Design a protein around this ligand. Structure first.
Ligand code: NAG
Lengths: 48, 49
């Protein structure tokens, strides 16, 4: 009491509701500013 | 070497040495690599063996 551990768990089991399932989240952060381009999209090539 | 708008450029050309170390005949210089450095190059140094 009055002394709480900072972190608790995400106890995950195969049987919950959708709101409690272990969702896998991956976020992509881009830097679209004026700087030398380093990562680019899959530019498409064709015949001649 | 040069650092225009970053994009460090290196040009090299190896000529089998003749009698003169730094002689005079013309020798073209070809690029080797160009990759985006983007840092304030002001000082320069060399390494030995
Ligand atoms: C150093 O290089 C970076 C690369 O963009 C640039 O933002 C900065 O302005 C340069 N330094 C100076 C004093 O211009």
């Amino acid at each position: 009491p009055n002394c709480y551990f900072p972190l608790q768990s995400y106890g995950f089991r195969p049987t919950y509701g959708v709101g409690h399932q272990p969702y896998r989240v991956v976020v992509l952060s881009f830097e679209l500013l004026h700087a030398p381009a380093t990562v680019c999209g899959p530019k498409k090539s064709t015949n001649l | 070497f040069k650092n225009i708008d970053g994009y460090f450029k290196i040009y090299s050309k190896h000529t089998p040495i003749i009698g003169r170390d730094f002689p005079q005949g013309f020798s073209a210089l070809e690029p080797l690599v160009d990759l985006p450095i983007g840092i304030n190059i002001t000082r320069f140094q060399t390494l030995l063996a």
